[PDB]
RNA sequence: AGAACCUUACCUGGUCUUGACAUCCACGGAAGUUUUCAGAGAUGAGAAUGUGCCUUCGGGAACCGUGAGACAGGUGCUGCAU
């Protein structure tokens, strides 16, 4: 829901879900053209922490 | 019309669909100007070890119904007899005894 | 203003635009003389004019396209005679008394089957 | 022999085609051969069913048969059961989904195809050919047909020299192209040889 | 011999990290210890001394190397680094050039009235940035022109 | 804006069917160029009729395919679906190029 | 968004019985998934349970 | 309305016979694919690989072969049986 002004005051769970989906899309891209082990280990580790 | 000669036609379209359009490349550009040495000369040797079938010139284009080799029509796939008996029935769309 | 008559001889299609003015003939951005004006009895491009309007105080703008020479020469002639529409049957009557108004509908024949040239049959022998 | 086919001369005039679809040059042949496959397979198994004509439509990668019979209750079985026993096999040969339609003819003695099988079925059941022929002429004029002409030719009667006898009634004008003359041909494998039946039915003047 | 290593930067300031890295090299003049710098990850041709490691981590807006451990960080598996770099480059063309190119290839429509339909691209127009694909409407493949972003590759 | 090129074998059908393809458009899009006929392709096949000798008895055949154009004016989404998705008359080809 | 954190087809229509924009603005066909943008056709509290 | 082989039915020679083409039976193997030698080729001997679909899995049948008899095949004859 927005506030008086109009800027949407967004919840915290939308930040969490949007982070997990951004990282998951990056990791899938790192499965198609993909990239070396160290890269996908950091990518999966950032998804785990997300 | 000689059911063996119908069966000899149906095996030739299979070999033309397994080898050639895929192994006509050996004659396509490997018989064109490049390193035209024994690399080319091997490829001119290497397409005779393919069967004597599987080239599209071996195909006869017999009738689809009667298998008659002469009198074929490459719009319908029938012979000239089987197109006329069908057309006067109304098995072939938009066709009639016309005159101009 | 501006007047018209078509003419359609022998699968050639003429567009004759008649207007009073000069006495020139323009045929498809060529003059008459350079198009076929030294060729093969051109008289039919003027045969209605030397019949009635000897003065020829009207310039002809002709654009014909289509088939051969004499048919194009004839389709012009049927075009001009139909283009005397403001100068009508007061003087198009004497046009009909010299023919001159028919399409001359005479197409070539279609080659029939069996034969060779739509009437010429290929030389049978009795034995 | 010397007469033109009465239906094939009238396709653009009165009688519609028995197969109406468009196809370009690339797909004209394999439509036509699959169209032949539905016609030979249906009459392969609808021999009891008294089937006259099978019209074919193709709406954009679809096949739509339309079967004209005089026994619509037999082909459906009960509640359209054996219709989709025919749909299963015509989906095989055509490769696309298949909607099946059916329209009855309540006057089977008025179309050329069924009066042929009113004759050509009996001739192998050792009926005298003049009896089956003349009954077919009487049956059509009884039911109000404006013309009828039926011809049988072959080794009929168990002879050795073939004949060609024919019976007619009323008006059957084969040069008046306004006429919707129904014409159909059939054959009869007897013991001595085949018998060709040719029946013309003149329905109306326009 | 100089082997490759992977550096993590603040994602978005990557060109500025690369420029500051080249400048720190030419400041602390360990010129014989760095080969190149390739472009959120920065590829560095390097050798491993602890001095050069402190140099790269003293470059600003750099988190650290990515490897098995932080004592002796790990060179480069280069399993699909080229393909990742290829994607980065392709993206440019894929967006800017948007070369609509497909034949007999099936595509997917998610825009206009043809949304939620698939079809094949009989003709392609990279110059006009338009794909010629027909969508089976009532069975009839309705050949329509859709943009690369208007349809998805199938 | 959108070329509508449609082909069929029957002239009384293709020209009947072009009346409603603009009636489903001028009801909503309210601007069409106009029904444009196109010169028909007549393919002839004249071929023998006997199963043997007498190569003088032939029967001339001809299959006439026609083409029509209407080339609708307005590319508003409503009109697009009322033509692209709404195709009628089985046995009539219709192909569109936007 | 077409298919984002806050989708239409995956969850439901924001407005009650309104599909999306130009489709179903009365009470007759509740359910038809319009082509303009894939969307469910239900009430306003249907997204709270999905 | 189109024979270099093909077509092709003719000829020499090399071959196989329940058969190249259909239905049926019993077995065994997914089917398929790659490649080598011997051979004029047909074929013969292989050598590798694949090992999918429905499940009562003691499965069955899309599919390749081997054996079974029904049969299949005939552009063989007679247009003066049709």
Curated annotation (Swiss-Prot), chain A:
Record text on subunit structure and interactions: The RNAP catalytic core consists of 2 alpha, 1 beta, 1 beta' and 1 omega subunit. When a sigma factor is associated with the core the holoenzyme is formed, which can initiate transcription. The rRNA transcription and antitermination complex (rrnTAC) consists of RNAP, NusA, NusB, NusE (rpsJ), NusG, SubB, ribosomal protein S4, DNA and precursor rRNA; S4 is more flexible than other subunits.
General function of this protein: DNA-dependent RNA polymerase (RNAP) catalyzes the transcription of DNA into RNA using the four ribonucleoside triphosphates as substrates.
Applied uses, from the record: Co-administration of salinamide and rifampicin or salinamide and myxopyronin suppresses the emergence of resistance to both antibiotics.
Descriptive protein name: DNA-directed RNA polymerase subunit beta'
Changes after translation: Acetylated on several lysine residues in the presence of glucose.
Gene: rpoC
Family named by the database record: Belongs to the RNA polymerase beta' chain family.
Shown stretch of the complete protein: 253 to 302 of 1407
Disulfide bonding pattern of the chain: none
Highest taxon listed in the record's lineage: Bacteria
UniProtKB/Swiss-Prot annotation, chain C:
Entry keyword set: Ribonucleoprotein, Ribosomal protein, RNA-binding, tRNA-binding
Cross-referenced InterPro entries: Ribosomal_Su5_D2-typ_SF, Ribosomal_uS9, Ribosomal_uS9_bac/plastid, Ribosomal_uS9_CS, Ribsml_uS5_D2-typ_fold_subgr
GO biological process, one term: cytoplasmic translation
Signal peptide segment: none
GO molecular function, one term: RNA binding
Alphabetized Gene3D superfamilies for the sequence: 3.30.230.10
A GO CC term assigned to this protein in UniProt: cytoplasm
Lineage: superkingdom: Bacteria
Pfam annotation, one family: Ribosomal_S9
Keyword Ribosomal protein in record: yes
Family as reported in the entry's similarity comment: Belongs to the universal ribosomal protein uS9 family.
Assembly and oligomerization: Part of the 30S ribosomal subunit. Contacts 16S rRNA. Cross-links to the P site tRNA and weakly to the A site tRNA.
Function: The C-terminal tail plays a role in the affinity of the 30S P site for different tRNAs. Mutations that decrease this affinity are suppressed in the 70S ribosome.
Protein name: Small ribosomal subunit protein uS9
Swiss-Prot record, chain E:
Keywords, in A-Z order: Ribosome biogenesis, Transcription, Transcription antitermination, Transcription regulation, Transcription termination
InterPro entries, A to Z: KOW, NGN, NGN-like_dom, NGN_dom_sf, NusG-like, Rib_uL2_dom2, Transcrpt_antiterm_NusG, Transcrpt_antiterm_NusG_bac_CS
Top-level taxonomic group: Bacteria
Domain KOW: 103-134
GO biological process, one term: DNA-templated transcription termination
The keyword Transcription appears for this protein: yes
Keyword Transcription recorded: yes
GO cellular component entries: cytosol; transcription elongation factor complex
SMART domains: KOW, NGN
Recorded domain comment: The N-terminal domain interacts with RNAP and the C-terminal domain binds either to Rho or to RpsJ (NusE). These domains are separated by a flexible linker.
Function as written in the Swiss-Prot or TrEMBL entry: Part of the processive rRNA transcription and antitermination complex (rrnTAC). The complex forms an RNA-chaperone ring around the RNA exit tunnel of RNA polymerase (RNAP). It supports rapid transcription and antitermination of rRNA operons, cotranscriptional rRNA folding, and annealing of distal rRNA regions to allow correct ribosome biogenesis. Participates in transcription elongation, termination and antitermination. In the absence of Rho, increases the rate of transcription elongation by the RNAP, probably by partially suppressing pausing.
Family as reported in the entry's similarity comment: Belongs to the NusG family.
Identification of the protein by name: Transcription termination/antitermination protein NusG
Gene giving rise to this polypeptide: nusG
Swiss-Prot record, chain F:
Gene Ontology CC, one term: cytosol
One term of GO molecular function: tRNA binding
Name of a matching Pfam family: Ribosomal_S10
Key words, A-Z: Ribonucleoprotein, Ribosomal protein, Ribosome biogenesis, RNA-binding, Transcription, Transcription antitermination, Transcription regulation
PROSITE patterns on file: RIBOSOMAL_S10 (PS00361)
UniProt-listed InterPro entries: Ribosomal_uS10, Ribosomal_uS10_CS, Ribosomal_uS10_dom, Ribosomal_uS10_dom_sf
GO biological process, one term: transcription antitermination
UniProt subunit comment: Part of the 30S ribosomal subunit. Can also form a heterodimer with the transcription antitermination protein NusB. Binding of S10 to NusB is mutually exclusive with its incorporation into the ribosome. The rRNA transcription and antitermination complex (rrnTAC) consists of RNAP, NusA, NusB, NusE (this protein), NusG, SubB, ribosomal protein S4, DNA and precursor rRNA; S4 is more flexible than other subunits.
Family as reported in the entry's similarity comment: Belongs to the universal ribosomal protein uS10 family.
Annotated protein name in UniProt: Small ribosomal subunit protein uS10
Recorded name of the encoding gene: rpsJ
